[PDB]
Write a protein that binds this ligand. Structure first.
Ligand code: SRM
Ligand code: SF4
Ligand code: NO2
Ligand code: CL
Ligand code: CL
Ligand code: K
Length: 538
């Protein structure tokens, strides 16, 4: 690799970071959008105010403004549902470590309630909230309301740092390694510039996902993150070994690899900055399918990339990885659903199953009420699109278990539901090939009616090859496709994946059977469970 290759490709200009003229040749259309107008201006210069006043039919008549609503607004966490819900926007937060409050939950509920049949909310596979039904004229008021309850939606889509994932049991688990909340909080504050916006990290070549590990269970899925902080002592000091480049895409899935670097705990933000700066400065900006950070690591080599991180550290020093970390390989991932004692004596947390992560406004109000009446007003989201309500006096549990809402959001659902994960799918997502959420519930219900089991089999349903529901981590994964019935008629189908493992001995699953009609999945899955996971016919 030439020294020429290491020339930073972006420069700061008027508070924003833009591609240098000499590196603009051959860029993808999204890069052209970012050059034509800096997306962060919609927030940081209040461009949203004037944009929100223009009727959508008029917005659609010019490239600049159509790109505003279809692309640039994703820097404000707003996602136009052009194909499947025209004129309406999904909105996605920053929610480091999945931690929310009853006040925030009620606020989000009040927004979606306004939109009636066009509104609902979802828990995401990055332990985050999404809301639906948002109309453009309401955006300025929603941004204000979010700020008032201590939320931001900044930089949650497109070429930005995505939600920082942590340990859902942070601070409450007797068995935790390190409380991940301070670190995920610090990362979120850094990424979003304390909710004001941080242009230094908003013009990446592509999305980029961080997590901080605090559990032996590895609830955080470090193996699939662009940066994962693995807790580790080095030379008598607490810090993190760093894994880099993990990602999924339609083209390629790759597990994170060691950077061969360790940082003391206080260097979490400096190293996140250094890595993001290296990626921003040096990343390829052509074919979008070759823009994720792992591709830069492949081009430079891990040592080449490491040197670029090192040069961007304060005092330009980066220690080598510590030989061992604090994560025990001897571990069985713990089921967090149900009632469990906290490390604080006299207190319990409860894990509640949220069927395919979908909630309506009334459901959100009920969950917020439970958190206030029984806990401390806190609600935690998980990457299996479930919830935990922590900080419940254990003496209140008998009463809690009698709450009617717990029949819908159960602390002890059937075992197959506990592990069921499904992406948005074609109810709202324009990329989706099939319907996912309703289908996956119906199929899982019919399968569990036929078999009993004891192994916690994890089933993931994703609507297209983008694999937002991570089918490659599943015991049994289902990827949307169109296929053919016995009469050659078009029907919805799934490619079925097997082999995904999580925790310390992680592994990426692969396609086992292509193009199975959805209507034929029940018998296939019943047999797989009996034949491979010890399930017993009922
Ligand atoms: C909501 C969520 C799935 C869910 O039901 O939980 C989701 C939904 C979408 N993802 Fe994703 N992704 C979600 C996690 C994922 C993950 C899983 C993860 O982060 O662990 C991945 C695979 C892991 C990865 O990227 O490394 C995933 C891979 C993608 C990709 C393909 C990435 C690539 O490099 O090719 C796209 C398309 C793209 O960016 O080009 C995408 C794009 C999309 C969009 C924004 C596409 C669009 O505008 O319609 C989806 C919005 C649909 C909607 O209305 O909800 N989504 N997306 C997740 C939101 C996470 C969050 O809170 O930030
Ligand atoms: S996997 Fe495909 S269908 Fe599902 S939310 Fe992601 S982009 Fe949409
Ligand atoms: O929107 N998930 O990259
Ligand atoms: Cl996006
Ligand atoms: Cl769309
Ligand atoms: K769930």
């Amino acid at each position: 690799v030439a020294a020429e290759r290491l020339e930073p490709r972006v420069e700061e200009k008027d508070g924003y970071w833009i591609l240098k003229e000499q590196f603009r040749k051959g860029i993808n259309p999204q890069e052209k959008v970012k050059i034509e107008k800096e997306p962060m201006k919609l927030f940081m210069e209040n461009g949203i105010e004037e944009l929100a006043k223009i009727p959508i039919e008029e917005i659609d008549q010019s490239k600049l403004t159509k790109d505003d609503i279809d692309v640039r607004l994703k820097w404000l966490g707003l996602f136009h549902r052009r194909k499947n819900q025209y004129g309406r926007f999904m909105m996605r937060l920053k929610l480091p470590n999945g931690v929310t409050t009853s006040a925030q939950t009620r606020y989000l509920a009040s927004v979606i309630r306004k939109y009636g049949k066009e509104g609902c909310a979802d828990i995401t596979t990055r332990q985050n909230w999404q809301i639906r039904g948002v109309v453009l004229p309401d955006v300025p008021e929603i941004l204000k309301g979010l700020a008032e309850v201590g939320l931001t939606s900044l930089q949650s889509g497109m070429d930005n740092v995505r939600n920082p994932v942590g340990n859902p049991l942070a601070g409450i688990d007797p068995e935790e390694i390190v409380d991940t909340r301070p670190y995920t909080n610090l990362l979120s504050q850094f990424i979003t510039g304390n909710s004001r916006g941080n242009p230094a990290v908003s013009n990446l070549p592509r999305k980029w996902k961080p997590c901080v590990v605090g559990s032996h269970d590895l609830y955080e899925h470090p193996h699939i993150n662009d940066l994962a902080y693995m807790p580790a002592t080095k030379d008598g000091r607490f810090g993190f070994n760093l894994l880099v480049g993990g990602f999924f895409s339609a083209k390629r899935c790759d597990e994170a690899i060691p950077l061969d670097a360790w940082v003391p705990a206080d260097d979490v933000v400096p190293v996140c900055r250094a890595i993001l700066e290296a990626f921003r400065d040096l990343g390829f900006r052509g074919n979008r399918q070759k823009c994720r950070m792992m591709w830069l690591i492949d081009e430079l080599g891990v040592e080449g990339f490491r040197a670029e991180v090192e040069k961007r550290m304060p005092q330009q020093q980066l220690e080598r990885a510590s030989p061992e970390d604090l994560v025990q390989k001897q571990w069985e991932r713990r089921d967090y659903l149900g009632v469990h004692p906290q490390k604080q004596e006299g207190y319990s947390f409860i894990g509640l199953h949220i069927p395919v992560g979908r909630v309506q406004a009334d459901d959100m109000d009920e969950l917020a009420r439970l958190a206030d009446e029984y806990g401390s007003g806190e609600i935690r989201l998980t990457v299996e699109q479930n919830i935990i309500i922590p900080n419940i006096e254990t003496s209140k549990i008998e009463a809690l278990l009698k709450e009617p809402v717990l029949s819908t959001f159960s602390p002890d659902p059937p075992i197959l539901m506990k592990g069921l994960v499904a992406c948005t799918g074609n109810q709202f997502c324009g990329q989706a090939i099939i319907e996912t959420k309703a289908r996956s519930l119906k199929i899982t219900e019919e399968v569990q009616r036929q078999v009993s089991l004891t192994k916690p089999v994890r089933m993931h349903w994703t609507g297209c090859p983008n694999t937002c529901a991570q089918v490659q981590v599943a015991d049994i994964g289902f990827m949307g496709c169109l296929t053919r019935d016995k009469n050659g008629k078009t029907v919805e189908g799934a490619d079925v994946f097997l082999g995904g493992r999580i925790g310390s001995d992680s592994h990426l699953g692969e396609v086992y059977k292509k193009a199975v009609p959805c209507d034929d999945l029940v018998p296939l899955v019943v047999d797989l469970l009996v034949n491979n996971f010890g399930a017993v016919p009922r």
